[PDB]
């Protein structure tokens, strides 16, 4: 039951639907750099609490995010050379952040992908870089030798990132640590000669949930399908789980749901 702060940066070279930079605390988005806006912007009410002590938060993040956007344009150009590609549409992605576990141990990561495949990532524990292929070994070079910059990243991942994460969690605890009760509804699909029993489970938060169809009380996976766990616009989640059940046998099947919002698990039949 840990918490994390996570940034996701995306750069595409030939256009589309056209730079993207999003910040999360525990899959709640709290900032984004609108490549239209050229501004790092708040996405939730509680992040403005950063302004009392750090009134420059928005300018600093904006200038840095702008810097990263320009760097990524350069990166996309250099990787074309490294992979000797005359030039199509290509993608550069960067993810980084930290994890603070409930036992007060921490982790962190710092990774780049080219065209959706790993390119290079920092190993915090050896202070070296893992190149995914022989072109990335060009990058592994410059960066393995930049001892000082590699330490800034270890410091950032191990300390700076954790300190902001701990600030953010307090700032946004009322919504970040809330629980919303799952809403479980069982429907029944075809009259004409087996039936599919559908369990819709929606409006729940946080994301973690255990949903199983049972048969005489036991977990059952035969002829069982499930949807995506997908976000509602109000930050809550939705999914479904189905089973094909038998003539005359409906009453053996119940939709079993376990979640932080349920002090006791629920078992819902048609």
């Amino acid at each position: 039951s840990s918490h994390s702060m996570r940034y996701f940066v995306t750069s595409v070279s030939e256009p589309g639907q056209p730079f993207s930079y999003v910040g999360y605390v525990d899959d709640q988005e709290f900032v984004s750099y609108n490549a239209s806006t050229r501004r790092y912007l708040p996405k939730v009410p509680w992040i403005s609490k950063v302004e009392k002590n750090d009134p420059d938060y928005w300018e600093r993040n904006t200038l840095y995010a702008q810097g990263h956007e320009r760097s990524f344009r350069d990166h996309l150009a250099t990787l074309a050379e490294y992979y000797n590609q005359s030039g199509g549409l290509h993608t550069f992605q960067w993810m980084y952040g930290c994890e603070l576990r409930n036992d007060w141990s921490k982790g962190g990561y710092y990774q780049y992908a080219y065209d959706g495949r790993d390119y290079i990532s920092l190993d915090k524990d050896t202070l070296t870089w893992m190149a995914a292929d022989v072109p990335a070994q060009n990058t592994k070079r410059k960066w393995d030798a930049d001892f000082r910059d590699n330490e800034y990243k270890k410091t950032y991942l191990e300390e700076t990132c954790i300190e902001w994460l701990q600030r953010y969690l307090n700032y946004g605890k009322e919504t970040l640590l809330r629980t919303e009760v799952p809403e479980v509804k069982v429907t029944r699909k075809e009259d004409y000669g087996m039936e599919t029993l559908i369990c819709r489970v929606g409006g729940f938060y946080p994301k973690d949930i255990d949903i199983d169809w049972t048969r005489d009380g036991e977990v059952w996976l035969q002829d069982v399908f499930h949807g995506l766990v997908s976000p509602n616009s109000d930050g809550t989640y939705y999914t479904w789980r189905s089973v094909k059940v038998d003539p005359k046998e409906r009453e053996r099947y119940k939709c079993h749901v376990e979640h932080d919002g349920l002090p006791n698990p629920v078992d819902v039949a048609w």
């Binding site: 940034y7 930079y21 910040g23 790092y40 938060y57 600093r60 993040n61 840095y64 995010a65 810097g67 990263h68 760097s71 350069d74 990166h75 250099t78 990787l79 980084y96 990058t139 410059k142 960066w143 930049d146 910059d149 800034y152 990243k153 950032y156 700076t160 990132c161 902001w164």
Partner: peptide
């Protein structure tokens, strides 16, 4: 808070 400035690839 985002990371600071980056180096050429």
């Amino acid at each position: 808070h985002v990371y600071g400035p980056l180096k050429p690839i």
